[PDB]
Write a protein that binds this ligand. Structure first.
Ligand SMILES: CCCCCCCCCCCCCCCCCC(=O)OC[C@H](COP(=O)(O)OCCN)OC(=O)CCCCCCCCCCCCC
Ligand code: HEM
Ligand SMILES: C/C=C(C)/C=C/C=C/[C@H](OC)[C@@H](C)[C@@H](OC)[C@@H](C)CCc1oc2c(O)c(OC)cc(OC)c2c(=O)c1C
Ligand code: FES
Lengths: 199, 123, 74, 127, 107, 330, 50
C-alpha cells in the first residue's frame, strides 16, 4: 500500500492521561467542551453523551442545568393532542446540529460529519490521531496531488483527501481561565474532552 | 422500487444508493472510461461479458455493489483496473464492473432498471 | 502568543536533517511543476507527486516535536 | 488497445474482384460488436458498404448487396471484403471500422482502419 | 435510403472564431446521428455519437445540438488546427448514410 | 438484539450500567484469552501425543468443541453490530453460498431476508446464548472420555506405577495458573481493554460501506489467511474448513512407536516450525493481499497441511528406525 | 394492507385503498420532511396522532 493510502503515522504526544496511574486532566476536559461547543458543535453531534454525565467532571450541577436549558426538546403533547416544546434537563442528551442525515450532507457538500462520542476509540491512533488531524493541515497539498474541489489535504487522513477543512485557528476561542487559546492548545483540549466522551 | 436523479450526478463520480437493502452503484462515466470499458479483450476475463450487455446507456454504469465472492461492498475508484476494489479478499473490478482479479467468480450483477428523462428507476 | 507546535516545527525545519528533507521535497516540487508545463501532461497516467518526500519530512518533524509539545501547553 | 490493420491489392482491373483484408488486434471479432466496411469516393463522399456481426450475420448496403461478400476468419481474427466485377465508379479509399451498439445511443463507429486506396485501372502492376 | 445534406458544404474561417456546421435528413431520425472528423492525411476518427455524446479523446470545445431532423456541430476555436472535412451519419435503420462533407479550411 | 438498537444497547452497558464496562471488557477480552488458552491446550496435545490411542475420542470431541467455540465467538461479535460485526456476518454466512445448487438458498435462510439485517442479528443473539450450553455439554463428554483413560504425562509412558490424588496437589497447582490467568486478564480489562480489538467495531454497522480497514478478529486470522491463499471461491472455503478437520488425521499419520516429542529431536524441531508457521499465517492474515504476502501465505498454507500429511509420517518413520539402529548391534 | 389481499380484496383494490392515505416519506435532498401515498407494506392508518 502506498504511503498516501495508509496516511501519515500519528506520533506519540505526552497525554497526561497516558499511563496506568494517570487520570484525565479535568481542567483540559472543561476547556475541550468549550471548544466543542464553539467550533465543533455546528457540524458534529455528541449523541451518546448525556448532560448529567458532565456534572462533577468538568462542570457543576447548576452550570450543566443552564447549558441544558438553552436547548429545546419535545415534550408530551397538550390536552388537545397538539405538539409542544420544553427546555432541556439533565436527563437529556446533548443535541446535534442537524435534524437528519440529508440535512447534514446538505450543509457539508455531500459529506456526513460523524458523531464524536466514540471517535477516540473508533480510530487507530486514538488521541494521537485526532490531535494530529486537527493540527496537521498544511496550507497547500504536496506537489502533483490533484485535490477534487471540495476537499482539503491532510496527510494523517488515509488517502490524504478529507472533506473537513481546517477549523482550528489561534485565539478563535476565548478560554474562561485565560489560557493561551492557540490551535494546538485547543486540539489538546477537545481531544482530551473527546477521550472522556468515549471513555 | 427506487428512483435516482441522474441530473445531479456530475462527471466522473460515483453514487451509492440503497435498494432492497443491497447497495446500488451508479457511475457517470467519462468518455475515456467508456472507451476503456468496450476496448478490453474477452480472453482477459474469467466472466466474459461485453460492456454493452451490462449497460443500456454507456454514460450510466448501474450495478449492485455486492462482491460476488463473499458479499462485501467494493470500494470505488480503487484497485488495479481503474474500477472497484473489494477490501475483504482482494477482488478487483474494472470500469465496467467486470471481475478482473481475485477470488470473486462473477462480474458485479446488473439489476433491472429503466430510464425516464433526468432520472432513472431501479427495481 | 503564537502556536507552540508551529514554532517547534519551524525550529526543526532548520536542523541539518530538516533542511536536507525540505530540500529533497522542494527538489521534487520543481520537477513536478516543470512536468505540468510540458505538452500533453494531462494524458500521462504516470504522473509524479511529492507525497513520499513530504511524508519523510513531516515524519522527521513529528518524531522531534511529539515528545516536546505538551511541556509547552497548559 | 484495439487496432485495425488493412491490407490488400490497391489496384484492380475493371471486371475483376476487389479483395481487402482487415486485421483486428486487442479485441476479438467474435466477442460482440459489428465489423464494417466503408468507402470514401474521390471528392469526399462517404458510403456505408456493409458488415459482419460477432456471430456471423451479414448486413450489406442494398446498393452493393449483389457483388460484395464480407467474410471473416475467427482463427486469425480478421474480416474481409470482396467486391466482384468492379467499375471505375468503385474507385475510392476503403476503410474497415468497428461499430459498437448500445440500446440507448444506438450505433457508433469508434475504431477506424488506416484506409486502403483502391483504383480500378487497366494499368499493369507487378504481382 | 435516407439522404443527408450538410451545410455549409465547404466553408472557411480564421483560427479563433466559433464555427457551426449542420446536417439535415429526409426522414425523421430520433437523435441517431454521429459526427466524424476526416484529417487531410486520410485519417478518420469519431467525434460525436448519438447527437451530443463526445467520444474518447475529443475536446470539450465540441458541441452537438439537434433533434428530429435538424442537427449541429459547434466549436470554439481551431488550436492547433481542426482543418478537416466533417461528416455526419444516421443509424435508425439500414442502410446507413453519410453527409456531403464540410471542409474547414483556414483563410 | 434489534439491529436498530444493538450497538446502542452495548454502549448503554458501557456507560449506564454500574460496572457494565467491566462486564463487557471481561467478556470481550475473555473471549481472546479463551482462544489463546485453547491454542496452547491444542498445541500441548500435538506435542505430547495426547491425540493418540487410547485418547482419540478425547481429541475428536475436542475438535468438535473448537469448532463450536469459534462459531459462538463469531455469533457474539455479530451482536455488537459495529462495522466489523456487519461485514463479518455477511462474509461468514456467505461462506455457505459455495455449496452447489442449494448454496444461495442456505444464505437467504441464515439471513432471513435479502441481506444481513434485523432477522439476522436477532437470531444470532438467540443462537449466541444457545451454543455455550452445547459447549458445556460437550465439555462433559470431553471429561468423560478423559476420565476412563486418565491424563497422559510429559514422558509419554504409563502413569500407572506412580499416581497422586487430584486433591491438594493439583487443586492447588491449578490455583496457581488461575490467579496468573486472572492477573494477566485484569491487566487488559483495566489497562488495555481495546488492544485485542478493532476500532472499526466502535462504528455502527453500515450496510453500504465495507471499511478498507476491515480485518477479522485476531484468533481467526490464520484460517482467514488460508482461505485467501486459494484464488478460487469454493476451493477457498473448503481448504479453510479442511484446515480444522485435518486435525482429525493426526492419530493415523503419527507412525511413531512412542507417544510425545520429548525424546524426539526431529519431531521437536518440526513441531516449532508448525507453531511459528501458524503464527506467520496469522500475520499474513493482517496484511493486504499484496505480492510478497500472497506467495508467503500460499507456501505457509502448504506447510500447514504438509505437517499433518507429510512431515509427521515421514519424520516419525525415520525416527522409529533411528532409535533402532542407534543401539541394536546385529 | 397487504394482508387484505387474497382474503377480502384483490391486489388492485387494496393498492387503491392504501393510496388514499398519506405517510411520512424519507426526507428530500435538503433534509425537509415529505409525504407519500400509502402502499401494501403499510399498516391501516389510525384516526388520531396520539
Ligand atoms: C488449529 C491449529 C492449533 C494449533 C495451533 C498452535 C498455536 C501455537 C500455540 C501458542 C503457544 C505454543 C505452545 C507450545 C506448545 C507446547 C510447548 C511444550 O510443551 O514445550 C515443552 C518443551 C520441553 O518440554 P519437555 O516435556 O519435552 O521437557 C522434558 C525434560 N526432560 O518446552 C519448550 O519447548 C519451551 C516452551 C516453548 C514456549 C512456546 C513458544 C511459542 C510462543 C508463541 C507466541 C505467540 C505469538 C502471539
Ligand atoms: C474542532 C471541532 C472539530 C473536531 C474535533 C472535528 C473532528 C473530526 C474528526 C475526528 C473527523 C473524523 C475523520 C475520520 O473519519 O477519520 C471529522 C470529520 C469531518 N468533520 Fe469535523 N471536527 C470539528 C469541526 C468540524 C466542523 C465545524 C465541521 C463542519 C463545517 C466539520 C465537518 C466534518 C466533515 C464533513 C467530516 C468528514 C470527513 C471525511 O470523511 O472526509 N468538522 N471531524
Ligand atoms: C448460525 C451460525 C453460523 C452461520 C455459523 C457459522 C460459522 C462459521 C465458521 O465457524 C465454524 C467460521 C466462523 C470460521 O470458519 C471455519 C472462521 C474461522 C471464519 C474466519 C473468517 O473470519 C472473518 C471475520 O471474522 C471477519 O470479520 C470482520 C471478516 C472476514 O472476511 C473479511 C472473515 C473471513 O473472511 C474469514 C474466513
Ligand atoms: S468479499 Fe470481496 S473479495 Fe471476498
Amino acid at each position: 500500500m502506498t504511503a498516501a493510502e495508509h496516511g501519515l503515522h500519528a506520533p506519540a504526544y505526552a497525554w497526561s492521561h497516558n499511563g496506568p496511574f494517570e487520570t484525565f486532566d479535568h481542567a483540559s476536559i472543561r476547556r475541550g467542551y468549550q471548544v466543542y461547543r464553539e467550533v465543533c458543535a455546528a457540524c458534529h453531534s455528541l449523541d451518546r453523551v448525556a448532560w448529567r454525565t458532565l456534572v462533577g467532571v468538568s462542570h457543576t450541577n447548576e452550570e450543566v442545568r443552564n447549558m441544558a436549558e438553552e436547548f429545546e426538546y419535545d415534550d408530551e403533547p397538550d390536552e388537545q393532542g397538539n405538539p409542544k416544546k420544553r427546555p432541556g434537563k439533565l436527563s437529556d442528551y446533548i443535541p446535534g446540529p442537524y435534524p437528519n442525515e440529508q440535512a447534514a450532507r446538505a450543509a457539508n457538500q455531500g459529506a456526513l460529519p460523524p458523531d464524536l462520542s466514540l471517535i477516540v476509540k473508533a480510530r487507530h491512533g486514538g488521541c494521537d490521531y485526532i490531535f494530529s488531524l486537527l493540527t496537521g493541515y498544511p496550507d497547500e497539498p504536496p506537489a502533483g496531488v490533484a485535490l477534487p474541489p471540495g476537499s482539503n489535504y491532510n496527510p494523517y487522513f488515509p488517502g490524504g483527501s478529507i472533506a473537513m477543512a481546517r477549523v482550528l485557528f489561534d485565539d478563535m476561542v476565548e478560554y474562561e481561565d485565560g489560557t493561551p487559546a492557540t490551535t494546538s492548545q485547543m486540539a489538546k483540549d477537545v481531544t482530551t474532552f473527546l477521550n472522556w466522551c468515549a471513555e | 422500487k427506487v428512483e435516482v436523479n441522474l441530473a445531479a450526478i456530475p462527471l466522473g463520480k460515483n453514487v451509492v444508493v440503497k435498494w432492497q437493502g443491497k447497495p446500488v452503484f451508479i457511475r457517470h462515466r467519462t468518455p475515456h472510461e467508456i472507451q476503456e470499458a468496450n476496448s478490453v479483450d474477452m480472453s482477459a476475463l474469467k466472466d466474459p461479458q461485453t460492456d454493452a450487455d451490462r449497460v443500456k446507456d454507456p454514460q450510466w454504469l448501474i450495478m449492485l455493489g455486492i462482491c460476488t465472492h463473499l458479499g462485501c461492498v467494493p470500494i470505488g475508484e480503487a484497485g488495479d483496473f481503474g474500477g472497484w476494489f473489494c477490501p475483504c479478499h482482494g477482488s478487483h473490478y474494472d470500469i465496467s464492473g467486470r471481475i478482473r482479479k481475485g477470488p470473486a467468480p462473477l462480474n458485479l450483477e446488473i439489476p433491472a432498471y429503466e430510464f425516464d428523462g433526468d432520472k432513472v428507476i431501479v427495481g | 502568543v503564537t502556536d507552540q507546535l508551529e514554532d517547534l516545527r519551524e525550529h526543526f525545519k532548520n536542523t541539518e536533517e530538516g533542511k536536507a528533507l525540505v530540500h529533497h521535497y522542494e527538489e521534487c516540487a520543481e520537477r513536478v511543476k516543470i512536468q505540468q508545463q510540458q505538452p500533453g501532461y494531462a494524458d500521462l497516467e504516470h504522473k509524479e507527486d511529492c507525497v513520499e518526500e513530504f511524508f519523510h519530512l513531516q515524519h522527521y518533524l513529528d518524531t522531534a516535536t511529539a515528545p516536546r509539545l505538551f511541556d509547552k501547553l497548559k | 488497445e484495439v487496432k485495425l490493420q488493412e491490407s490488400g491489392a490497391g489496384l484492380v482491373q475493371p471486371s475483376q474482384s476487389l479483395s481487402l483484408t482487415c486485421s483486428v488486434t486487442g479485441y476479438s471479432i467474435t466477442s460482440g460488436y459489428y465489423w464494417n466496411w466503408i468507402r470514401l469516393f474521390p471528392g469526399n463522399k462517404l458510403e456505408w458498404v456493409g458488415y459482419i456481426s460477432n456471430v456471423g450475420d451479414n448486413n450489406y448496403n442494398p446498393s452493393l448487396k449483389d457483388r460484395l461478400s464480407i467474410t471473416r476468419d475467427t482463427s486469425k481474427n480478421q474480416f474481409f471484403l470482396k467486391l466482384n466485377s468492379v467499375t471505375t465508379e468503385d474507385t475510392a479509399t476503403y476503410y474497415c471500422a468497428r461499430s459498437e451498439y448500445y440500446s440507448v445511443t444506438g450505433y457508433a463507429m469508434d475504431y477506424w482502419g488506416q484506409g486502403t486506396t483502391v483504383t480500378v485501372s487497366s494499368a499493369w502492376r507487378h504481382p | 435510403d435516407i439522404e443527408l445534406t450538410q451545410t455549409p458544404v465547404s466553408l472557411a474561417a480564421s483560427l479563433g472564431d466559433r464555427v457551426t456546421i449542420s446536417c439535415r435528413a429526409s426522414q425523421d431520425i430520433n437523435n441517431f446521428l454521429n459526427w466524424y472528423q476526416q484529417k487531410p492525411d486520410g485519417t478518420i476518427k469519431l467525434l460525436i455519437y448519438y447527437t451530443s455524446r463526445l467520444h474518447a479523446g475529443v475536446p470539450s470545445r465540441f458541441s452537438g445540438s439537434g433533434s428530429g431532423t435538424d442537427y449541429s456541430l459547434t466549436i470554439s476555436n481551431l488550436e492547433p488546427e481542426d482543418i478537416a472535412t466533417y461528416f455526419c451519419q444516421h443509424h435508425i435503420k439500414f442502410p446507413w448514410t453519410f453527409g456531403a462533407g464540410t471542409k474547414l479550411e483556414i483563410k | 438484539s434489534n439491529i436498530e438498537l444493538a450497538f446502542s444497547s452495548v454502549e448503554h452497558i458501557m456507560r449506564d450500567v454500574h460496572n457494565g464496562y467491566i462486564l463487557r471488557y471481561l467478556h470481550a477480552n475473555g473471549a481472546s484469552f479463551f482462544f489463546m488458552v485453547m491454542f496452547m491446550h491444542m498445541a500441548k496435545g500435538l506435542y505430547y501425543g495426547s491425540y493418540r490411542s487410547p485418547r482419540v475420542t478425547l481429541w475428536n470431541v475436542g475438535v468438535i468443541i473448537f469448532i463450536l467455540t469459534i462459531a459462538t465467538a463469531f455469533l457474539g461479535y455479530c451482536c455488537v453490530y459495529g462495522q466489523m460485526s456487519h461485514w463479518g456476518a455477511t462474509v461468514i454466512t456467505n461462506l455457505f453460498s459455495a455449496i452447489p445448487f442449494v448454496g444461495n438458498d442456505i444464505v437467504s435462510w441464515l439471513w432471513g431476508g435479502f441481506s444481513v439485517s434485523n432477522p439476522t442479528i436477532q437470531r444470532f443473539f438467540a443462537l449466541h446464548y444457545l451454543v455455550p450450553f452445547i459447549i458445556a455439554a460437550m465439555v462433559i463428554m470431553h471429561l468423560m472420555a478423559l476420565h476412563i483413560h486418565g491424563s497422559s504425562n510429559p514422558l509419554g509412558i504409563t502413569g500407572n506405577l506412580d499416581r497422586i490424588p487430584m486433591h491438594s496437589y493439583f487443586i492447588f497447582k491449578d490455583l496457581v495458573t488461575v490467579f496468573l490467568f486472572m492477573l494477566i486478564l485484569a491487566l487488559f480489562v483495566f489497562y488495555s481493554p481495546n488492544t485485542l480489538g478493532h476500532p472499526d467495531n466502535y462504528i455502527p454497522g453500515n450496510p453500504l460501506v465495507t471499511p478498507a480497514s476491515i480485518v477479522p478478529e485476531w484468533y481467526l486470522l490464520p484460517f482467514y489467511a488460508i482461505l485467501r491463499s486459494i484464488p478460487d471461491k469454493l476451493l477457498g472455503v473448503i481448504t479453510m474448513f479442511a484446515a480444522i478437520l485435518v486435525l482429525l488425521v493426526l492419530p493415523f499419520t503419527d507412525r511413531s512407536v512412542v507417544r510425545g516429542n520429548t525424546f524426539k529431536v526431529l519431531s521437536k524441531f518440526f513441531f516449532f516450525i508448525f507453531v511459528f508457521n501458524f503464527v506467520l499465517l496469522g500475520q499474513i492474515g493482517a496484511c493486504h493481499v499484496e505480492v510478497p504476502y500472497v506467495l508467503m501465505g500460499q507456501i505457509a498454507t502448504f506447510i500447514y497441511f504438509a505437517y499433518f500429511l507429510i512431515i509427521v509420517p515421514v519424520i516419525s518413520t525415520i525416527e522409529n528406525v533411528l532409535f533402532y539402529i542407534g543401539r541394536v548391534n546385529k
